[PDB]
Amino acid sequence: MKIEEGKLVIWINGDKGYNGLAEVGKKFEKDTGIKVTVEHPDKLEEKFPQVAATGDGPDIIFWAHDRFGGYAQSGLLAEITPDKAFQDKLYPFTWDAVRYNGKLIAYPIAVEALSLIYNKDLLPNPPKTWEEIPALDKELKAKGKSALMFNLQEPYFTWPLIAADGGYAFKYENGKYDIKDVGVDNAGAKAGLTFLVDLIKNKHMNADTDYSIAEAAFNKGETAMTINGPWAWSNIDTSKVNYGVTVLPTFKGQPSKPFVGVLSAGINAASPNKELAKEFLENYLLTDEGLEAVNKDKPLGAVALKSYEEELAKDPRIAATMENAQKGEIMPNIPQMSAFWYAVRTAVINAASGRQAVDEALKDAQTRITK
Ligand code: NA
Ligand code: NA
Ligand code: NA
Ligand code: NA
Ligand code: NA
Ligand code: NA
DSSP states (O other): SSSSEEEEEEETTTOOOHHHHHHHHHHHHHHHHEEEEEETTTTTTHHHHHTTTTTSSSSSEEHHHHHHHHHHHTBOOOOOOHHHHTTTBBBBHHHHHHHETEEOOOEEEEOOOOOOEEEEEOOOOSSBBSTTTTHHHHOOOOTTOEEOOOOOOSSHHHHHHHHHHTSSSEEEEEEEEEEOOOBBBSSHHHHHHHHHHHHHTSSSSSSSOHHHHHHHHHHTOOOOEEOOGGGGGGSSSSSOOEEEEEEOOOBBOOOOOOOOEEEEEEBBBBSSOOHHHHHHIIISSSSSHHHHHHHHHHOOOOBBBBHHHHHHHSSHHHHHHHHHHHEEEEOOOSSTTTHHHHHHHHHHHHHHTTOOOOOHHHHHHHHHHHH
């Protein structure tokens, strides 16, 4: 057949633990006699919709859930059939990330979100609120340091604060998103962006701080805190910096709302191996031993499977990742989300520089996203 019956071909990106996944496949092959081939093609997220559109490609694809919206719109993904008992083995918010048009189209694997990263030697008790941070910065500036540096140029990094007091991208209801219910220019978003702009106006942050500056400042020990994700941990210079990772600060008593990415496993709609793929994903990969094999190769971060997350969370960085993810916002998987990134990027830049008042900046963004 076009996709070969009686084997599994799996695509996963080259920055994931594909050797560990291959070992899960080897266990599957020993139990079933079914060959499992793990591949990590370049540009696989672009290749997959091309080959799957002709009924070809891998049996299983692994990618962040938000890309699977577009795949599901094109009918590239099988509706999966986990029973209710299996569903109860994963944190319930992860299933929401893999619903499209009401139907489950993938298995959640792992969970990623921003956290507050802090220098224990500069700040052994990091702030629980954003409101504390101006006064803390003044104290640290007096001793030659700063409180907080993070990427202000990209809304992925500023949204956690902007949205804390009631902002949101699109309202989620019943496995679907309301494209008319956008939370970009409401009073909560205005409050959060005002607080951010005030941090800049009061000289606690510089409006041109980007990813490079924040990472370098924190790694040099110049700033007590940054905001970044699990991809950054390996790069933190632990020779210079005894760092911790914790829950993001609250604003107006409300948690920060980082976007959540859920690494997910979809089954090709054209696969003749859908029962094999289900068996592999449910009863080999989504087990403590299967996730351990992948994680030992390249860390997954926090995971969707409760039994293994409860083990991983002995690492406080992973516990913090999951806490911030549970309080955060699943990234919408709908096409209108592309309008969100560029509209909000523009709004925050214009607000932080003074080109636009906060209110008019967010109003213009709201209009574009809802057009
Ligand atoms: Na194999
Ligand atoms: Na406090
Ligand atoms: Na448990
Ligand atoms: Na264990
Ligand atoms: Na005002
Ligand atoms: Na409006």
